[PDB]
């Protein structure tokens, strides 16, 4: 079976040679005449306290008003960013949650984690109570990230190197995506919903389409596990944060690594990655209790935003790009503008 | 004015709902912080189920001793890769590490796993209530003479029973030498990195022991005291 690895190496060398032939100039020397962002100071406008244990994930939704946050108590608390009012506090049968999602229309909320079960809840009830609308099983490993396509379909990345698309009323998987060697830890959907990427624990970000179960392309160039991923608002690029203290922006069309954001001063690993509305600002939440903002054109650290007593776990930016929500392990959600 | 009055009525209703939710969270505060959460780690043959038997994807059991509650987790539904979900168990107060003393092939990987747990960034401040399961099988194996410690640990020849060690009443010195060699092997890597903060709590237990819950309760009391002696400068 050595000869199969031999032509695998041959095609790898062909891919490397083709990538070398495709690229001649990097984005760094291309963008020199663009004026820099400038020093930006985002004060802590709101502080959304009340979670019993550490927070892992959050989501915003189409309206820039209602957060949802999952904590290790087993609580999904749905906040209100304008008035800091806890609209709902859904309890969980399993305290080990790891991710949460908020539907584009404010109807459904999702959670899951070490119980290997994706739970979907209705944010409407004629009886007036929040109930477990659906339980989704079929994943052997822990669920790392869930996202909503619409009110019907939900794509979930699990701990057994599988990303599965699920139909809510059917209750079973419709299309599985395999090919990763390590645990997938992040998931980001396209503005046109056609494509989505998954970054795994093998420095690999694989791009998939939600219709047929194929990997469009693979992106490599990191050194450790990928902890976060996020598309560009344009939909043709995406930035990945890893444990190697580097944020790497890749291009879908070029099938190549575009830009690196790192410094010799930084020592920890990136946990969360997000963009702004225009896409120039890359906000990355690190493990050194702070978050760093970067320009996506010149890799200059525009500012450092602090105020957390533990590692930053989740970062989110509203669909209109108004505010940035940060959630750390000290049970404190912070809104920044 | 009627529309403004209705808007204020809805705003006060939302504020009342928020206050009710906050009251429920404050009610759950004491109940959540009263309980102690423990995570079990070990091998497949380590027998990490005999620890609590009288009061008995994720295997959870609850036992209460002397008005102190204990959740006990045995996550084994995942794959063998541990570097990702082990960050979830950071708020636990202790880790019950169960090691089969009779087997020697898995003893080295148990040592490596314990070293990784001790030196982890997100498990740095977690104390380990380290157990030594299956003492009787170890005793029969070492009195049989078919298997030798020196085949897997060359430093057994240059080792003797510590004077601090208190042997069980009635046994040959060989079983004590072997079991305290394993205890010292775990404690050597337990007391090499962590400068205070977290400590190992070695114990010797068998399949017929009926008081392991008491050991866990006393050790968790000690861990709670040493944790309360951390934010305060007293130590």
């Amino acid at each position, epitope marked *: 079976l050595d000869q199969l690895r031999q032509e695998a190496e041959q095609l790898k060398n062909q891919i490397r040679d083709a990538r070398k032939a495709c690229a001649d100039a990097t984005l760094s020397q291309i963008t020199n005449n663009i004026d820099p962002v400038g020093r930006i100071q985002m004060r802590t406008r709101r502080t959304l306290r009340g979670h019993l244990a550490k927070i892992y994930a959050m989501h915003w939704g189409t309206d820039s008003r209602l957060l949802v946050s999952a904590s290790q108590d087993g609580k999904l608390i749905i906040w209100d960013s304008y008035t800091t009012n806890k609209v709902h506090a859904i309890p969980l049968r399993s305290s080990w949650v790891m991710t949460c999602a908020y539907a584009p229309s404010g109807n459904y909320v999702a959670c899951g984690g070490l119980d290997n079960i994706c739970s979907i809840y209705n944010l409407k009830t004629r009886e007036g109570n929040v109930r477990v609308s659906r339980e989704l099983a079929g994943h052997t490993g822990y669920l790392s990230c869930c996202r909503f396509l619409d009110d019907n379909q939900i794509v979930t990345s699990s701990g057994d190197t599988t990303c599965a698309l699920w139909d809510i009323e059917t209750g079973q998987q419709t299309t599985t995506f395999t090919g990763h060697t390590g645990d997938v830890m992040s998931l980001s959907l396209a503005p046109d919903t056609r494509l989505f990427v998954s970054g795994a624990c*093998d420095a690999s970000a694989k791009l998939w389409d939600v219709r047929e179960g194929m990997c469009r392309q693979t992106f*490599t160039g990191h*050194e450790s596990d990928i902890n976060a991923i996020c598309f560009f608002p344009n939909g043709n690029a995406f930035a990945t944060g890893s444990d190697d203290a580097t944020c790497r922006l890749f291009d879908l069309r070029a099938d190549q690594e575009l830009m690196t954001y790192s410094h010799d001063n930084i020592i920890c690993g990136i946990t969360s990655v997000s963009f702004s509305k225009s896409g120039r600002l890359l906000l990355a939440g690190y493990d050194d209790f702070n978050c760093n903002v970067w320009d996506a054109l010149k890799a200059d650290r525009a500012g450092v935003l602090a105020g957390h007593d533990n590692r930053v776990s989740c970062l989110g930016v509203t669909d209109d790009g108004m505010a940035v929500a940060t959630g750390s392990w000290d049970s404190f959600l912070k809104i920044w503008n | 004015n009627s529309k403004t009055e209705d808007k204020r009525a809805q705003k006060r209703a939302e504020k009342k709902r928020s206050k009710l939710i906050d009251k429920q969270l404050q009610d759950e505060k004491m109940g959540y912080m009263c309980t102690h959460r423990l995570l079990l780690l070990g091998a497949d043959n380590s027998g990490k189920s005999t620890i609590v038997k009288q009061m008995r994807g994720i295997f959870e059991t609850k036992f209460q001793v002397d008005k102190v509650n204990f959740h006990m987790f045995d996550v084994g539904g995942q794959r063998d890769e541990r570097r990702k979900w082990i960050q979830c168990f950071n708020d636990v107060t202790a880790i019950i590490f169960v090691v089969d003393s009779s087997d020697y092939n898995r003893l080295q990987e148990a040592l490596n796993l314990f070293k990784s747990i001790w030196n982890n960034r997100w498990l740095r401040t977690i104390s380990v209530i380290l157990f030594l399961n299956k003492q009787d099988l170890l005793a029969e194996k070492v009195l049989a003479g078919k298997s030798k410690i020196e085949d897997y640990f060359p430093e057994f020849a240059r080792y003797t029973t510590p004077e601090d060690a208190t042997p069980e009443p009635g046994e040959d010195p060989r079983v004590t030498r072997a079991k305290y060699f394993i205890r010292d092997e775990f404690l050597r890597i337990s007391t090499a990195s962590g400068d205070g903060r977290h400590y190992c709590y070695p114990h010797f237990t068998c399949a017929v022991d009926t008081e392991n819950a008491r050991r866990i309760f006393n050790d968790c009391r000690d861990i709670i005291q040493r944790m309360h002696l951390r934010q305060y400068e007293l130590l």
Partner: nanobody
Amino acid sequence: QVQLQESGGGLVQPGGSLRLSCAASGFTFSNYKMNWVRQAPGKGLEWVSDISQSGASISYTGSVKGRFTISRDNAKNTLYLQMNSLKPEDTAVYYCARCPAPFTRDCFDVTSTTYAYRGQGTQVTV
């Protein structure tokens, strides 16, 4: 892209001396702890040796304590392991596994082939 190349080993009579070379491409080799892990026929994965970033702290499995030696070269980005006075149960497929973290002294490399940061290994037959 991360890659690890393993060279050396083969049909070696017992009692001989054998050197195994692991070359690292991709990452910065001068920053990562590195482990040597063997898989024997009919058994599972088991850890053999490790070496830190600067080589200050090393450790060996008791079955290979003393005879085995390990070294690394950060300028060449290549590490070496030498075995002397071999006993015939050492026949196995050997891998150099990278410790998947930037600045640590601990990680988790004994996994059932699902690990990523590990080369194809070399088969040593004795």
